[PDB]
C-alpha cells in the first residue's frame with residue numbers, strides 16, 4: 584500500500600507473498616489454511632472467506648490488540664476478494680488436543696501452572712482493553728515451543744456448542760447470567776477461565792462429565808460445582824471456585840487472577 588495514499592493501512596499485504604497450502608487441522612478450524620510467507624520462509628495460518636462484514640470486524644479488532652499471549656495478527660488481504668487474515672502459526676496446535684496427547688512427565692504440574700499463568704495474562708490485557716472474549720476455552724488456545732500458550736478465537740460455534748439464544752453456545756463454559764439473560768461481560772469470561780483451569784488440571788477432559796446439558800443451569804443454581812480434579816493443588820481449585828461465584832460481581836478480576844498465579848508459579852518453579 585502507498586504510504587502516501589489516503590487509504591494507507593499498514594496491515595494490508597500482497598496476496599502473492601503468501602503461498603497457501605492445505606487446510607489447517609484437517610479442516611477443524613474451517614476456512615483456515617496453512618501458508619508460507621514467501622519473503623520470510625515463514626509458516627503462517629491464513630483464514631479466508633455476507634459474513635464479509637463480520638470478517639472485516641474481526642480484522643479491525645485484531646489490529647487493535649497486541650500481547651505476547653494473544654495470537655499475533657501478521658497482516659490482512661481485504662483490498663479485494665478473497666479476503667485474508669494472516670496470523671502466526673503455532674507449532675503444536677490447539678491447547679485442548681495438546682493436553683490430551685502430551686507427555687505428562689514433560690507437561691508436569693509446574694507447566695500446567697505456567698500455562699494458566701500465560702492465559703490469565705492474556706485475559707488481564709483484554710480486560711484492560713475492555714474487550715470481551717465470549718468463548719474462552721482450551722480449544723481456543725494455541726501452544727508453541729517451550730510451552731508457550733496464546734489465547735485465540737477461532738469462531739468455532741459454527742464449525743460442545745448447542746442451539747441456544749438463537750446462536751450456538753458452549754453451555755458447559757457459559758456463565759449463568761449468560762445462559763439466562765444473554766448478558767456477556769469480562770466476568771462471564773472469568774467464569775469460562777475457571778472451566779478452562781479445570782480442563783488444564785485434567786489434561787483436557789470434557790467439563791461436567793456425563794451430566795446432560797439440560798441440567799447444568801439448574802444444578803449451578805443449586806450450588807453444584809465441579810469437584811477438585813485429582814492432583815489439582817488446593818490453591819488452584821480455590822481459584823476455580825472463586826471464578827464460579829454465582830454473582831459475577833463476586834468473581835475475581837483477571838488482574839487478581841493473574842496476580843495469584845504469578846505468586847504460585849514462582850513458588851513452585853523458583
Ligand SMILES: Cc1ccc(NC(=O)c2ccc(CN3CC[C@H](N(C)C)C3)c(C(F)(F)F)c2)cc1Nc1nccc(-c2cncnc2)n1
Nearest residue numbers: 612615628629630668670672673676715716717734735736
Ligand atoms: C488465520 C486466523 C485468523 C483470525 C484469527 N483470530 C483470532 O484468533 C481472534 C479474533 C478476535 C479476538 C478478540 N475479539 C474481541 C472480542 C471478540 N468476541 C468474539 C466478542 C473476540 C481474539 C483474541 F485472542 F484476542 F481473543 C482472537 C486467528 C487465526 N489463526 C488461526 N486460526 C485457526 C487455527 C490456527 C492455528 C495456528 N497454528 C497452529 N495450528 C492452528 N490459527
